[PDB]
């Protein structure tokens, strides 16, 4: 990529068009002012994946971001794409969990172990093909190449280093093939011809000789090149936007068939057209599975709060004391795995304690009602948790129960849930069980 | 001997460069830091690159410490394109060779002088908390480091007690209507100084310059105080670099001291001096080593108490700034000195509705209150209430300058 050749043009400003590169650093409108592109950078396939929902009515995704400007910019584009459904079934994309890719150049199992739990039958990301080949054997070791696991990667898979590969049946795309240099040259020639047909509406310096003043008519030509629409190119109607952005409204869809990119369909403007020859899946299926399997394990966190919760030390056998009520009926016990916290600080014991009170019998009755299984935990912080500002990062972060639930580390919470605007903003709520003041 | 190079495009002060050289007191020398060049009134950057190839033909050069008497950040971008690409660590103290605006490369080695834009914004917060004023607007043009700039300022306001509750940002990438939209007694602004003439013409058209409103700009668009456009209004205060006492023999001695200290760590702890290069493209076979060549000793240097630590912003972490006020005669007049998170007092010119108010402490109508030293000196809903410094009656009893905060009925 001839970067300083482009960088010299930013002083005697010249309208430049980009032929080959899909790097997102060239979309920066501060330094790359007039540097258009025949091809959008790789964030366009995030818009392709936003088209991929309501192709087969798909509604869950977990992402992995390359810790780089490319993955962050693609994440920003898809985040802006997800701001929709302002009406007027609510089965749109709702999983939306994000993890990080680029430190997975050595170990990805810490991410994949979290990925295999949270009801994911989802596609994830485009990545560097070498670490993609690492996660292809890693997730196959963790058995994420199964039948229900839907898999789609993007553009960098098609490189030959990804041939420690991709369980058979995984969808690839081809937005712009475009690599006819006749079609690359002459369509740009038509674009600049329709440009100069309006640039004839009535001078740059002598290059790099003394005069370092900006040729202002270049930036004035930029607004005219914001009108040079060439609807009759070899690649069809050539369009533009404020920063490159060819706006090619077609792609072509293929999947692997014993490492053969067998085409599944195309796109046409607004019509995703599947030439449905064969539907392959990583478990060799021919259906179109979606959603997930709903689990039944719920790990509830809490803090010791009488008389809602009675954390009590267990006996020498680990079980609670067989204590009774006032009528001789035994109080229902639950071995609650607390934090270390048999003392302030970090005690050596991390001992599961007992649990009595309101919410224990309430949760037992609710588990018998809803007919689901059961786990427990206690909060290590011991605080309700406010949105405290993280130091030197200007980010206000919750703590306590909301330090675990909003981080996804915990399941549903029963608590003395004091309700405000902000907790309702981040946590969906049930109706108030016990009215208070 | 260590071939280093200095050039200031415009000056004629070689005797100051010899006084900054001053090679007799150097008891602690490494391999000898030789430095000699000639100046050339030329802004052509390709000529500068051929002069870089000329220095590599002179075979001694490893790094340079040079500047120019203009305000051109484009050559700082060129340095980021080229010298940050190949090898070269460059320090520059004048104008656009100090004003870095666009970016800093990740594989860079050079550095330009001046404080961070958010650090300068913190200086504005310090002086405006001294004067107890509050911005109730903001206008800002498009410039690199703007969203994080306004996020840092607003997030600093959210943590405070008394903040700048305003009239959120009008980014200027209906001009008279948009400048008539926001109103404030004290207005914080940023705009490029070349565009600031037209922007101040629009501000004079909407009358914002005539409402007794004060305008505060950062130093990077407060370029050199000897030429001010007439459309730039009066009474504008700004914080800037020390144009008064920091000249050539200070800056060349500082650059050569930083370079020689980086040397006398790099060739001493590790006993490894890098090799000077000869070509400007064919030297690539040994400068591929993004390696131990990358300096750690560059980011921590002090010489005779003058510290220089700098972060990854292209800005140092211990700056010394002066506060200048634009007069009606297009004259930038120094009113205050900002050392590291502290101010100076001498010229607190704070400025009919101005009426004198006298009172005496009687409960509960009055001050029952001290001044908190840290978090917003007069805390909340309490006007600052100056008191005469009752001293020994041979010097002057100072009116004001010991203050309290009035609450009461």
């Amino acid at each position: 990529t001839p970067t300083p050749v482009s960088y010299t043009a930013g002083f005697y400003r010249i309208p430049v068009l980009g032929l080959t590169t899909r790097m997102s650093i060239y979309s920066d409108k501060s330094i790359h002012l007039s540097f258009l592109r025949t091809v959008p950078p790789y964030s366009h396939q995030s818009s392709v994946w936003f088209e991929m929902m309501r192709v087969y009515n798909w509604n869950h995704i977990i992402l992995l971001v390359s810790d780089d400007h490319e993955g962050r910019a693609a994440q920003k584009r898809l985040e802006t794409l997800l701001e929709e459904r302002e009406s007027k079934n609510k089965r749109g994309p709702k999983a939306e969990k994000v993890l990080q890719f680029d430190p997975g150049t050595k170990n990805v199992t810490a991410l994949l172990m979290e990925a295999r739990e949270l009801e994911a039958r989802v596609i994830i990301l485009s990545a560097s093909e070498d670490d993609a080949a690492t996660v292809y054997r890693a997730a196959a070791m963790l058995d994420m190449t199964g039948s229900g696991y839907v898999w789609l990667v993007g553009e960098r898979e098609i490189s030959g280093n990804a041939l420690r590969y991709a369980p058979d049946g995984i969808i690839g795309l081809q937005l712009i093939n475009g690599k006819n240099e006749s079609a690359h040259i002459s369509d740009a020639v038509g674009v600049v011809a329709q440009a100069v047909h309006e640039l004839l509406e009535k001078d740059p310096p002598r290059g790099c000789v003394g005069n370092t003043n900006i040729w202002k008519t270049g930036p004035l030509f930029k607004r005219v090149l914001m009108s040079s629409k060439y609807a009759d190119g070899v690649t069809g109607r050539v369009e533009f936007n404020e920063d490159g952005d060819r706006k090619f409204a077609q792609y072509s869809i293929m999947n692997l068939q014993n490492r053969k990119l067998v085409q599944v369909g195309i796109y046409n403007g607004t019509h995703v057209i599947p030439n449905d020859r064969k539907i392959i899946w990583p478990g060799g299926e021919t259906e179109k599975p979606r959603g997930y399997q709903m689990s039944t394990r719920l790990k509830i966190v809490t803090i010791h709060q009488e008389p809602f919760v009675y954390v009590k030390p267990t006996m020498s056998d680990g079980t609670c004391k067989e204590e009774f009520t006032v009528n001789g009926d035994p109080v229902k016990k639950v071995i609650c795995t607390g934090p270390n916290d048999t003392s302030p600080g970090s005690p050596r014991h991390t001992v599961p304690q007992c649990c009595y009170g309101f919410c224990i019998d309430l949760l037992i009755k609710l588990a018998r009602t809803m007919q689901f299984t059961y786990e427990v935990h206690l909060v290590a912080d011991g605080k309700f948790g406010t949105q405290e500002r993280v130091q030197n990062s200007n980010k206000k972060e919750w703590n306590g129960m909301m330090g675990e639930l909003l981080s996804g580390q915990a399941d549903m919470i029963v608590a003395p849930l004091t309700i405000n605007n902000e907790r309702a903003q981040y946590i969906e709520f049930s109706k108030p069980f016990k009215y208070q003041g | 001997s260590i071939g280093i190079a200095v050039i200031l495009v415009g000056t004629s002060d070689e005797v100051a460069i010899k006084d900054a050289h001053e090679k007799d007191d150097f008891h602690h020398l490494s391999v000898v830091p030789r430095v000699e060049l000639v100046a050339m009134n030329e802004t052509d950057p390709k000529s500068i690159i051929t002069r870089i190839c000329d220095l590599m033909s002179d075979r001694k050069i490893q790094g340079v410490v040079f500047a120019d008497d203009t305000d051109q950040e484009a050559i700082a971008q060129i340095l980021d394109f080229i010298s940050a690409q190949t090898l070269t660590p460059i320090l520059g103290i004048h104008g656009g060779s100090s004003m870095i605006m666009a970016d800093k490369d990740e594989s860079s080695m050079f550095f330009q002088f001046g404080p961070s834009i958010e650090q300068q914004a913190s200086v504005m917060l310090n002086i405006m908390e001294e004067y107890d004023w509050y911005i109730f607007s903001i206008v800002t043009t498009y410039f690199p480091g703007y969203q994080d700039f306004v996020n840092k300022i607003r997030s600093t306001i959210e943590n405070s007690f008394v903040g700048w509750e305003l009239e959120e940002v009008l980014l200027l990438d209906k001009i008279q209507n948009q400048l008539k939209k926001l109103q404030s007694p004290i207005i914080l602004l940023y705009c490029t100084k070349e565009e600031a003439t037209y922007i101040f013409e629009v501000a004079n058209s909407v009358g914002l310059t005539g409402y007794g409103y004060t305008w505060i700009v950062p130093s990077l668009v407060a370029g050199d105080t000897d030429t001010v456009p007439s459309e730039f209004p009066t009474g504008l205060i700004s914080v800037s670099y020390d144009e008064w006492d920091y000249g050539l023999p200070a800056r060349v001695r500082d650059g050569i001291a930083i370079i020689t200290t980086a040397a006398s760590d790099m060739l001493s702890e590790h006993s490894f001096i890098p090799e000077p290069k000869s070509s400007c493209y064919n030297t690539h076979e040994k400068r591929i080593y993004q390696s131990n060549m990358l300096n750690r000793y560059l980011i921590n240097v002090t010489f005779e108490g003058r510290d220089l630590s700098f972060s990854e912003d292209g800005y140092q972490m211990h700056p010394k700034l002066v506060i200048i006020l634009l007069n009606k005669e297009r004259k930038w007049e120094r009113v205050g000195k900002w050392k590291d998170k502290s101010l100076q007092m001498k010229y607190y010119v704070w400025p009919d509705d101005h009426l004198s108010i006298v009172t005496l402490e009687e409960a509960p109508f009055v001050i029952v209150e001290s001044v908190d030293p840290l978090s917003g000196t007069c805390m909340r809903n309490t006007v600052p209430c100056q008191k005469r410094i009752i001293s020994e009656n041979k010097t002057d009893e100072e009116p004001g300058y010991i203050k309290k905060c009035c609450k009461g009925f």
Partner: antibody
Amino acid sequence: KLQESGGGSVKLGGSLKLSCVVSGFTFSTYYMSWVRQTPEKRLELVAVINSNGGNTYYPDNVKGRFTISRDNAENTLYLQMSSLKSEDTALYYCARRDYDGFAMDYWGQGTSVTVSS
Amino acid sequence: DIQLTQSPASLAVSLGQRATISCRASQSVSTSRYSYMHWYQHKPGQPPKLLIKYASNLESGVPARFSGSGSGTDFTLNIHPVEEEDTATYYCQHSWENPYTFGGGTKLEIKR
């Protein structure tokens, strides 16, 4: 590639010139150093020299004891040991050639020096 | 000076197992873009050859079963799989602002 030689038996406080032969590369394009490997599996890095010898480095025990020299024509740079003690009884290697590059990459089979009376 | 501590000093593993070779330091020896170390191997009858650069970067053609990582003070190496030819003598040498400290030195045994 490389061959460190010039070893043998020497008394306490004796002298020995250790040899280090360049085999198959240009010699003044990098940095030199020398290591000594004890039978107790401990690294005694001896000294650092420059390709012109303008940067000679010793550690504290090597300061006042041992001497490095150059043979730039034959490309066999030497270490001249003196005031030898029983802790200097070790194998002896070399360490060079990272090409600025301020690490060291080439170690050899080396030679053995013993210091006993 | 920053000191290197390596464990287990007499490593005995099986072939095919992802063998973990840990290295702990006394101070952080890294930055955002790089780090100064070099990990390597030899047989005791063999010359030392370089294997791993700066934390992980590979030299000339070592088998890629060895995969080293770690940062700050910790440093690891994943041998997956283990070969029978790994009865080596080896450590890493600290170089961060001091190319003088060397590792503790672990040795290889094969539980086969």
